[PDB]
């Protein structure tokens, strides 16, 4: 089941904010797995359990009593060490069957503007290379990658046109979902 | 710092205002689900995830620990409150606009801190209620947040739209306008 990382227990209005982010970093599939659990007062991270370090370590002075207190309890250290498998490695297996299997094909669209904007819309994952019959480079501006927050991205690529001879301008999109690159003429 | 994928298998949040909280899981910057701490239910933000099971009691229990940790840290830091950030609102359409063919209007309310905000939509002067939906507070690496509101529209020739944001950082509501 979805295993959560657990918080360690400490011993114009005003707000006091506490954040606990159980974070898993995965690189080369599950070959390199790393847990870093952040305890945060307001926007300042106070303590951190890094699976590479193997202990609670204070980031700021405010989190020094906590770092030593949690390091003295042997149960908490054994549990936080195991969280790499129980939480990161466990949950990743579910990701392999669902999020890491997700793929939405980009919908490429060339259209002029107030200069041609190639709109590469509604695609997942975030890997994409959009390029404009020679590779035009100096007169091109891409927006940064746009995260829509509904599990889809978009990216816009504008090209300043000085045309002649009826030469075709083509948008070339490469993406993990695509079994062959998309070309759109203009 | 550098990885092929990054997830938060626990984005536990607890603030004094209210008080309130938010338990969410995030994978690669996107919200997999949230637990409604009142109704006590995992609400999947992705259909394909509906096959899994997250127990609401797990979220409720962490929020209780978080309340404790917060109280002690209020006293230890001699009652230091949060600093209000200036939210950077941005409005855009999900796909290229074609008149008459439905679309979604996205209002990204970036750099939110503390995570307490109001996000509403305006069509031709007055508010819109139908079609509005929004993501939970999505965590940031600098420990601030951001929310995204959505307004399902049928692009019209005359019609204009606005996103009304009300954070404590702003002295008057930010009204970002949408330009076809």
């Amino acid at each position, epitope marked *: 089941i979805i295993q959560p990382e657990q918080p360690a227990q400490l011993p114009s209005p005003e707000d006091f904010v506490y954040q606990f982010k159980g974070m898993c970093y995965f690189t080369n599939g599950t070959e390199r797995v790393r847990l870093v659990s952040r305890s945060i007062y307001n926007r300042e991270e106070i303590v951190r359990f890094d699976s590479d370090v193997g202990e609670f370590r204070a980031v700021t002075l405010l989190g020094l009593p906590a770092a030593e207190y949690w390091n003295s309890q042997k*149960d908490i250290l054994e*549990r936080k060490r195991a969280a790499v498998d129980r939480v990161c490695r466990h949950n990743y297996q579910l990701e392999l069957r669902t999020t890491l299997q997700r793929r939405v094909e980009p919908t490429v669209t060339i259209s002029p503007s107030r200069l041609l904007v190639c709109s590469v819309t509604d695609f997942y994952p975030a890997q994409i290379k959009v390029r404009w019959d020679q590779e035009e480079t100096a007169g091109v501006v891409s927006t940064p990658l746009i995260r829509n927050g509904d599990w889809t991205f978009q990216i816009l690529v504008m090209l300043e046109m000085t045309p002649q001879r009826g030469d075709v301008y083509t948008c070339h999109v490469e993406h993990p979902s695509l079994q062959s690159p998309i070309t759109v003429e203009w | 710092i550098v990885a092929d994928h990054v997830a938060s298998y626990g984005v536990n949040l607890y603030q004094s205002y209210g008080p309130s909280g938010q338990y969410t899981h995030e994978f690669d910057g996107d919200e997999q689900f949230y637990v409604d701490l*009142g109704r*006590k239910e995992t609400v999947w933000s992705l259909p394909v995830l509906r096959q899994f099971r997250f127990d609401p*009691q797990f979220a409720l229990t962490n929020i209780a*620990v978080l309340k*404790h940790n917060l109280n002690s840290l209020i006293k230890r830091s001699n009652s230091t409150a949060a600093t209000n950030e200036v939210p950077e609102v941005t409005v855009f359409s999900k796909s290229p606009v074609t008149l008459g063919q439905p679309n979604i209007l996205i209002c990204l309310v970036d750099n939110i801190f503390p995570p307490v905000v109001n996000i509403t939509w305006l069509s031709n002067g007055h508010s819109v209620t139908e079609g509005v939906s929004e993501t939970s507070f999505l965590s940031k690496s600098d420990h601030s947040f951001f929310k995204i509101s959505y307004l399902t529209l049928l692009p019209s020739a005359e019609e204009s739209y606005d996103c009304k944001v009300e954070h404590w950082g702003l002295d008057k509501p930010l009204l970002k306008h949408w330009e076809p």
Partner: antibody
Amino acid sequence: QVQLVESGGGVVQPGRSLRLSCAASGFTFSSWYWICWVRQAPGKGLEWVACIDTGSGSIDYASWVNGRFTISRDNSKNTLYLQMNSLRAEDTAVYYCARDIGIDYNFWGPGTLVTVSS
Amino acid sequence: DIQMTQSPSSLSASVGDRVTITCQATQSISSYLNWYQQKPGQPPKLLIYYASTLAYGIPARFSGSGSGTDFTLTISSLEPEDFAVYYCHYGISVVSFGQGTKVEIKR
């Protein structure tokens, strides 16, 4: 200090009803806690009755309850209630009142004895 | 409700002895099982939460093990103040408890 005090126990005839209270001192419901009514038979195990989210008002009842018992709260009075209706002699037990069960540094009540006899 | 049963219904043990009580759940409750103790006339005292044998100070002889459905309370070297009813618990708002284990003196 922080404590919870039960009240309302006694002899109640089968078929009749009883309302218990649970006064809270040392804390305010206002800061939202999940307070519960856990009953324990005479010489038997601990059994759950119901829980209430003092913030939103969210109630949860045990499977055996079936509309017979009704938990409620008054944040202004910082008191918890449990209206026990349609009582059978099988319901005779001690009723505990507990804040955030399972979380550390969290209190329980002494108990209140409800006896259901004719 | 999640039903969970305890392995020794009751047990007879001596001071110095090692005691092992188990709690099996109907479903996976992750690492969220808690161990409560109850001496006559008093409400339960929490021994362990998650599997962290913590309090403002609970005796280090108590230890919690297990994750998923099967859990184990282990008292390494029994002391005389440990003859009590032991319970396993789950849930902050939808609460389940075990069919307690009595820890009785052997003679």
